[PDB]
């Protein structure tokens, strides 16, 4: 019976708290994977900065020859 | 003891001497802060907005040579900061600065 009374108390406390404190709350939207997707996107950005750099012809303004 | 108020006339002319045109009024406010810190032993100095307007009245290149300000030390009533007291500097409109001394405004 003690467990049941504890459950009742918890439920009433939660209801009171929400009514007098918490703000707007989303119903359910398949709670974002962002908690680990932060590190996943950190690795993804490490991949993104690893994009291939195209080769280029090095400029060199040389002088004249010889005669 | 530490709640006294008094008036000072700061010579901005000899403190902003040799500074650039675009860094003269900000230097004037920096010198006002330094003057308040040196006179009143409070690292926290708050400048009144009207004092800023008085400093900036004639643009950034031309700052008034003399300006008379009130130096008031307060209690910092509610902030739980390491600085126990702070100083408030208020602009005093004055016609002429001749024979004006650092008169202490008794409370």
């Amino acid at each position: 019976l003690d467990k049941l009374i504890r459950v009742g108390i918890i439920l009433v406390l939660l209801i009171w708290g929400t009514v007098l404190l918490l703000k707007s709350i989303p119903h359910h939207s398949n709670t974002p994977d962002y908690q680990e997707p932060n590190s996943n996107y950190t690795n993804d950005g490490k991949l993104k900065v690893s994009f291939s750099v195209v080769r280029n012809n090095t400029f060199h303004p040389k002088y004249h020859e010889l005669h | 003891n530490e709640v006294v108020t008094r008036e000072y006339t700061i010579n901005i002319h000899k403190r902003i001497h040799g500074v650039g045109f675009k860094k003269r009024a900000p230097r004037a406010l920096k010198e006002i802060r330094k003057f308040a810190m040196k006179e009143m032993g409070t690292p926290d100095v708050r400048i009144d907005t009207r004092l800023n307007k008085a400093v900036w009245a004639k643009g950034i290149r031309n700052v008034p040579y003399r300006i008379r300000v009130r130096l008031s030390r307060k209690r910092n009533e509610d902030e739980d900061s390491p600085n126990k007291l702070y100083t408030l500097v208020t602009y005093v409109p004055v016609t002429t600065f001749k024979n004006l001394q650092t008169v202490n405004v008794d409370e």
Binding site: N30, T31, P32, D33, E36, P37, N40, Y41, N43, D44, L47, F51 | -
Partner: protein, 50 residues
């Protein structure tokens, strides 16, 4: 371009729908080797050269 044709609009719509990230519950599957979408497309780089 605000003057697009129907085919181009359908292509853009399909790309936009494909740009979304991978759902989290995929990671909990038994035989899963995928950690991120790895095919995300941003509009600054990889300019979708139509």
């Amino acid at each position: 371009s605000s003057h697009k044709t129907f085919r181009i609009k359908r292509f853009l719509a399909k790309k936009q729908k494909q740009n979304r990230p991978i759902p989290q519950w995929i990671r909990m599957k038994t035989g899963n080797k995928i950690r991120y979408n790895s095919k995300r497309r941003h509009w600054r780089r990889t300019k979708l050269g139509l």
